[PDB]
Design a protein around this ligand. Structure first.
Ligand SMILES: [K+]
Ligand SMILES: [Mg+2]
Ligand SMILES: [Mg+2]
Ligand SMILES: [Mg+2]
Ligand SMILES: [Mg+2]
Ligand SMILES: [Mg+2]
Ligand SMILES: [Mg+2]
Ligand SMILES: [Mg+2]
Ligand SMILES: [Mg+2]
Ligand SMILES: [Mg+2]
Ligand SMILES: [Mg+2]
Ligand SMILES: [Mg+2]
Ligand SMILES: [Mg+2]
Ligand SMILES: [Mg+2]
Ligand SMILES: [Mg+2]
Lengths: 75, 128, 190, 50, 467, 116, 160, 53
RNA sequence: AUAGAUGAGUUUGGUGAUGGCUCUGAUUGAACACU
RNA sequence: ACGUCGAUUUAUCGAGUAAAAUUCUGUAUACAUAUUGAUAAUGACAAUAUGUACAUUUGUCUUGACUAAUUACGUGCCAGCAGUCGCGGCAAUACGUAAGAGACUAGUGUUAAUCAUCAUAAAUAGGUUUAAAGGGUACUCAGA
């Protein structure tokens, strides 16, 4: 698997903010409070789309995609 | 046990377990040839009931074992050269061996249609 | 909408307070099924003890146990008893547990270990169901002493609730506990 | 072990987690108990420490 | 100032003791203990250089939620700085005078950091608090007084002037109590510090250990504003209150408090003493004949130069910022090292321990200073030789951001009267409720309503006397 | 996922060959991976050989198939980037759950995490 | 010897298991070494040596112990301040490794593996919250301190 | 090179952020491990000889 | 070499333990039976 | 072949896109040619490359649970099955037939053996009140 990383974030931040607090990051209010307040809290500093999971389980038969006869079919 | 007790040799191998077919397990052979000494019948123990066809065989090594005759109906008698393989009749004491039915003198069940490989039955060759 | 024509979910519809259609979206699975027997003055009385796990697949798992002379009623009891006992289970990156946990339930010790992503649920047949229902995807397990089906599930459920909270360990020691994988990639790589 | 597991000191920690997310994935968490915010800033005292 | 710029700016200069200050870190608590009981925990360059790097470091961590500063012994919290040492350096040529200016530079850099700190700061005033000790507390939002507290600024008696920013805290005190405490260098003990307004809370010294263990249990959320954090600590301090004494009455209150406002409202010491002479004169209606007489005996025993300079900044300090104060005080205290009164008063009272008679100021008395004289004009002109004080940060403010945790003063009572229709007795109750029955609110509010409250329309309403 | 349009393949080829721009610049300009930019040129060079050798191309099969797949025309109308060009390979060492105990006020950077 | 560290590991557990505020340990050069490591790691509150009775808790840090001569060395003792947070002790487990019957020595190449949750030798990987103390030339450090200083030594105990 | 690096890390200064964030341990307890002989041993022995008599 | 650690059937009126046996995985310089 | 076969609800459920048929390829192999194994020269024998040509078998185990996969009839603790628990005493999903189903395949099963399972001789890493297992006792040389 791979991980997308944009250069804009790296240039500004060096990952220190990710360790703020007790090592995991600055905590945010619960969801049932953000809907109550009128103004939305400031967005967290991190890479774009850095909370969606990756489908590792669906790469079981990836080795078969390396065969020459399969690659001709996928093309 | 303390490290000292282990230094003096406290860890010994576990007591051996008896094999299902000692005559074959002892010499690492899959099967042996023997001369049928007696073809009789053995009765199962408490739960089971019936007449199990067995055969007293004298192996080539010299051991005299009791083998079980699988299938329905056999054609062996006194002085029959039969092939012995491992196995055991779970309800017959002393019957710790089986006899191959496609063996030298023991014939296979001719009226067998399922699991012919287990009873040494050639295919009927109906169309052929 | 006719989903519950028997009325078994009505009593549960008040405790947890959610539609019956939402109760059918929960992952349920019968784990244990014992045939117990009580000797009475009127002869043996055989019952069916069952343990069912309920989870939505996003960090909630409930364990329920019940018994009855009928196998059908015993499963519906535990199912309702497991959906109302749901509790949030902390999961690291929504894929594994925090660190390692070792629990003991009357001679049945269970040792769960956190594993890197892409490792899979290389666990036994009962833990696979609990992890697959709670939302975990990478884990390792090992039964040290005994393999009793029931205590095996009780110990594993108590282990998913006895995980070391990395923040409580930090405030107690006065020292940060940095998530190296978070700083390295700039966020929680799920 | 004639005693019982009393978790009276963690009613907030437990209630705060059960109210953070919703059991029905895909919906916002419902409002928490009316007492969750009252004792938000009044933690319990340390007990059982000789 | 990062962790590296601080360590290089506060190097452990040769001579600094290893255990001058004793730091500690609990769950959420960070303590600071001035460990020098032999000298009443007197501040010095060695101690200041150990506290500034820590405070800067704890400011970058979100796990440290409450800071506490306290003393070591059971007698003093911080009994002034090493003023006796600066006198010797001042007598070693210009090279030695700059060392004194450097010391005041470090001290002002620390007090400013404490005034603009981004975390709750508490001060256990369990002992005598003078000089440098008054700098570590007055700017903090919480100042816990006890039975052992002895507040004072014995700075005009040694020829010196007020201190690290009392010139910013005193002007905006209720009425003219600020200049009074400075010029006369009064001595407030125990609960009188709580009533005067210097201290925000008053607990018994035996309940301070239990208070710390509680401040550590508090674990605020990262998304809480500083206002929420200070409110949670304010309600936690009020839980350990055993109640103010039942017999001790407000010292500066009623008659004495009115006299302070009638004799310290002028801009010239000649008029102030002239007004006091009227009070001391038998037959006056003020009723402070004994007090006025005692105050005069103390005003004619201090350096007349400091009085002029002191009163001068009390009128100017009402418009300066917290940061502008330190910068001006540095350029101001830099010229006091060159003066004759300071080097004389310190030597004649601390090094000589009163030997060779009392101090002998360059001007014998205020009478010598002619009316046209304006000696309080050179100490307010920064020279180019002394570089401008470089503070650790740019934070500043004209009024304290969070300084309303103490007892209600005239400003609060006024705001209530001007925004309501409360009566004499119904107004006192309004404060006992909002303050959650804080000890001493009924006695403090009643006093304010006994000096600046007139029963114009009867029991229906109450108005102020100024009109 | 969209595939490089026929006319788009030429834009990448002409930029690297005619204008002689570095592959990295072309990869970052159109948000195309350097591994794909190099393949587009290799495959395009084989076309020049076929056209030079007077070989018949599979034009009937190319036009019909390209109508079944999503395309991304580069140049002016660049709605979205073709793909992610900064994807990093997940090293086995960086997959471990590590909680290093450090000072409460430490500036843990990516460099420090790599050493952990 | 190592027998003292083993007794110290068991006692600190029994004291935390009993939820005691203070704990006493025999005043030895070896015990003070590990105690400073636990304090530097954040498990115990403070360390001050005193007589058979604990110092005044109000002035624990300010406590000024008397000199340790042959006239009182037989009565001295190390008083440790235990920690409890969130209804749970901070020093729950202190499982030892190097016992009197066998001293386990680890290399830098092995500690680097144990520091990331991978077994090496007679040790096991460290998980979240766990901690391993090693006695080396530079004092009784932590496996992550010894890995930074690039040294091995004698493994003392594992703390959870 | 591997010897200098291995020797440079074993004699490196403690991290500043880890020096400013550590509780103070009095030197009287963390460094006074030497146990000298009682200076008054000769006096106590003489006095103890009288009392025992 | 950093992905590598997994269980199942079976004693009891029944539950929980203890302790074997057997199956599940890989293999052979293998033999036999049916092909 | 708008046929056939097995079930049955004559239209349901299947054999079944299966077959036949049509359109292509020329795989193992056959043959030819060339190079090469080798060079100073020597080729027993064959490999490699290219050209042309051909569409060539099914077999076997299992089907109560462990263990993926069902009914019918016959048999009646008989005959037999079984790696373990077990099945069979006249309406047997476990035996023997028939059909269907599950799976491996020029292999498929069985027997024998080895490792792992087994922390089941535990150095890593066990245990001994009531379950295998504390010596009748502790002074003591060696030894830890
Ligand atoms: K004090
Ligand atoms: Mg049997
Ligand atoms: Mg069949
Ligand atoms: Mg069969
Ligand atoms: Mg019984
Ligand atoms: Mg067992
Ligand atoms: Mg060919
Ligand atoms: Mg030759
Ligand atoms: Mg099945
Ligand atoms: Mg049985
Ligand atoms: Mg059958
Ligand atoms: Mg083959
Ligand atoms: Mg005995
Ligand atoms: Mg004997
Ligand atoms: Mg005996």
């Amino acid at each position: 698997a791979v991980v997308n990383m944009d250069p804009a974030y790296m240039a500004k931040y060096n990952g220190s903010e990710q360790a703020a607090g007790r090592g995991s990051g600055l905590s945010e209010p619960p969801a049932y409070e953000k809907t109550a307040d009128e103004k939305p809290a400031k967005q967290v500093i991190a890479n774009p789309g850095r909370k969606v999971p990756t489908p590792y389980e669906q790469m079981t038969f990836a080795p078969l995609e390396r065969r020459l006869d399969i690659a001709i079919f996928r093309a | 046990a303390t490290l000292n007790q282990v230094m003096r040799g406290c860890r010994k191998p576990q007591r051996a377990r008896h094999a299902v077919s000692p005559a074959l397990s002892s010499i690492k052979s899959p099967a042996l040839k023997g001369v049928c000494v007696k073809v009789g019948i053995t009765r199962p123990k408490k739960p089971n009931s019936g007449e199990r066809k067995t055969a007293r065989v004298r192996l080539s090594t010299g051991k005299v074992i009791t083998a079980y005759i699988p299938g329905e109906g056999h054609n062996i008698s006194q002085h029959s050269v039969v092939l012995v393989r491992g196995g055991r009749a779970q309800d017959c004491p002393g019957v710790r061996y089986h006899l191959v039915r496609g063996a030298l003198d023991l014939a296979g069940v001719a009226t067998r249609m399922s699991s012919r490989s287990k009873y040494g039955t050639k295919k009927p060759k109906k169309a052929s | 909408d006719g989903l519950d024509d028997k009325g078994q979910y009505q009593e549960l519809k008040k405790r947890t307070g959610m539609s019956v259609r939402q109760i059918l979206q929960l992952k349920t699975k019968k784990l244990v099924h014992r045939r117990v027997v009580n000797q009475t003055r009127l002869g043996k009385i055989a019952s069916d003890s069952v343990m069912v796990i309920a989870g939505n697949g996003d960090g909630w798992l409930g364990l329920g146990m019940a018994k009855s002379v009928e196998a059908s009623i015993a499963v519906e009891k535990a199912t309702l008893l497991a959906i109302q006992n749901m509790q949030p289970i902390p999961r690291y990156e929504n894929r594994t547990i925090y660190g390692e946990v070792t629990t003991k339930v009357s001679g049945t010790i269970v040792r769960l270990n956190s594993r890197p992503p892409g490792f899979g649920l290389r666990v036994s047949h009962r833990i696979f169901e609990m992890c697959r229902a709670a939302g975990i995807r990478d884990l390792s397990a090992k039964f040290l002493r005994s393999r009793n089906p029931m205590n095996t599930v009780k110990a594993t459920y108590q282990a998913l609730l006895s995980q070391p909270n990395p923040e409580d360990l930090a405030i107690g020691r006065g020292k940060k506990l940095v998530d190296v994988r978070k700083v390295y990639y700039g966020g929680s790589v799920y | 072990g004639k005693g019982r597991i009393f978790q009276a000191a963690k009613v907030y920690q437990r209630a705060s987690e059960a109210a953070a997310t919703n059991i029905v994935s895909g919906l916002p968490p419902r409002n928490p108990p009316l007492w969750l915010k009252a004792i938000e800033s009044i933690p319990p005292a340390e007990i059982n420490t000789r | 100032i990062s962790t590296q710029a601080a360590a290089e700016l506060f190097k452990p200069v040769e001579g600094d003791e290893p255990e001058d200050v004793l730091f500690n870190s609990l769950y959420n608590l960070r303590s600071v203990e001035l460990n020098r009981p032999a000298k009443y925990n007197a501040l010095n360059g060695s101690m200041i250089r150990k506290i500034a790097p820590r405070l800067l470091e704890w400011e970058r961590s979100d796990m440290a939620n409450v800071i506490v500063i306290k003393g070591s012994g059971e007698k003093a919290f911080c009994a002034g700085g090493d003023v006796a040492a600066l006198a010797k350096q001042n007598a070693e040529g210009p090279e030695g005078v700059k060392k004194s200016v450097d010391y005041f530079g470090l001290e002002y850099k620390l007090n400013h950091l404490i005034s603009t700190y981004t975390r709750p700061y508490v001060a256990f005033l369990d002992g005598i608090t003078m000089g440098g000790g008054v700098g570590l507390s007055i700017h903090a939002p919480f100042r816990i007084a006890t039975e052992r507290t002895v507040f004072a600024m014995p700075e005009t008696k040694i020829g010196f002037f007020p201190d690290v920013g009392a010139s910013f805290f005193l002007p905006r005190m209720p009425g003219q109590v600020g200049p009074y405490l400075g010029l006369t260098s009064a001595l407030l003990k125990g609960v009188q510090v709580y009533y005067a307004g210097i201290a925000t809370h008053y607990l018994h010294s035996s309940s301070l250990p239990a208070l710390e263990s509680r401040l550590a249990e508090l674990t605020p959320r990262d998304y809480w504003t500083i206002e929420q954090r200070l409110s949670v600590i304010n309600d936690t301090i009020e839980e350990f209150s055993t109640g103010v004494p039942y017999d001790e009455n407000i010292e500066i209150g009623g008659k004495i408090r009115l006299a302070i406002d009638r004799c310290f409202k002028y801009d010239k010491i000649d008029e102030i003493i002239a007004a006091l002479k009227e009070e001391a004169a038998e037959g006056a209606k003020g009723g402070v004949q004994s007090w006025a007489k005692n105050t005069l005996e103390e005003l004619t025993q201090r350096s007349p130069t400091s009085l002029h300079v002191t009163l001068r900044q009390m009128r100017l300090g009402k418009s300066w910022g917290i940061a502008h104060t330190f910068k001006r005080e540095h350029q101001m205290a830099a010229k006091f090292m060159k003066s004759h009164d300071f080097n004389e008063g310190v030597t004649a009272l601390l090094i000589d321990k009163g030997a060779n008679g009392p101090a002998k100021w360059k001007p014998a008395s205020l009478d010598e200073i002619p009316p046209g004289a304006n000696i309080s004009e050179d100490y307010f002109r920064n020279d180019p030789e002394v570089p401008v004080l470089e503070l650790l940060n740019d934070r500043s403010y004209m009024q304290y951001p969070y300084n309303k945790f103490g007892l209600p003063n005239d400003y609060d009572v006024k705001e209530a009267i001007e925004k309501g229709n409360f009566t004499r007795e119904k107004l006192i109750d309004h404060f006992v409720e909002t303050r959650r029955g804080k000890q001493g609110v009924r006695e403090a509010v009643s006093d304010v309503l006994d000096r600046m409250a007139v029963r114009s329309k009867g029991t229906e309403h109450v108005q102020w006397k100024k009109e | 996922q969209p595939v490089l349009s026929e006319g788009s393949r030429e834009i990448i080829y002409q930029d690297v060959m005619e204008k002689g721009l570095p592959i990295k610049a072309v990869s970052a300009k159109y948000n195309v991976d350097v591994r794909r930019v190099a393949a587009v040129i290799r495959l395009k060079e084989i076309e020049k050989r076929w056209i030079k050798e007077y070989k018949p191309l599979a034009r009937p099969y190319a036009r019909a198939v390209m109508k079944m797949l999503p395309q991304t025309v580069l140049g002016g109308p660049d709605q979205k980037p073709h793909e992610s060009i900064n994807d990093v390979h997940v090293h086995s060492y960086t997959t471990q759950q590590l909680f290093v105990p450090v000072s409460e006020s430490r500036e843990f950077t990516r460099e420090d995490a790599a050493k952990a | 010897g190592i027998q003292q560290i083993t007794n110290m590991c068991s006692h600190l557990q029994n004291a935390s298991r009993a939820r005691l505020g203070l704990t006493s340990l025999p005043n030895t050069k070896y015990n003070l070494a590990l105690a400073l490591a636990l304090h530097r790691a954040g498990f115990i509150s403070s360390i001050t040596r005193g007589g058979p009775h604990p110092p005044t808790p109000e002035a624990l840090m300010t406590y000024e112990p008397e000199p340790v001569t042959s006239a009182n060395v037989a009565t001295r003792r190390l008083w440790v301040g235990l920690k409890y947070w969130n209804e749970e002790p901070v020093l729950k487990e202190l499982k030892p490794i190097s016992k009197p019957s066998r001293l386990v020595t680890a290399s830098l190449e092995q500690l680097n593996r144990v520091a990331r949750g991978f077994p090496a030798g007679y040790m096991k990987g460290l998980q979240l919250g766990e901690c391993l103390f090693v006695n080396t030339d530079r004092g009784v450090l932590e496996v992550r301190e010894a890995v930074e200083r690039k040294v091995g030594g004698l493994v003392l105990c594992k703390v959870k | 090179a591997r010897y200098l690096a291995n020797k440079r890390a074993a004699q490196a200064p403690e991290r500043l952020d880890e020096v400013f964030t550590r509780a103070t341990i009095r030197e009287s307890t963390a460094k006074n491990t030497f146990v000298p002989l009682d200076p008054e041993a000769f006096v106590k022995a003489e006095e103890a000889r009288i009392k025992h008599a």
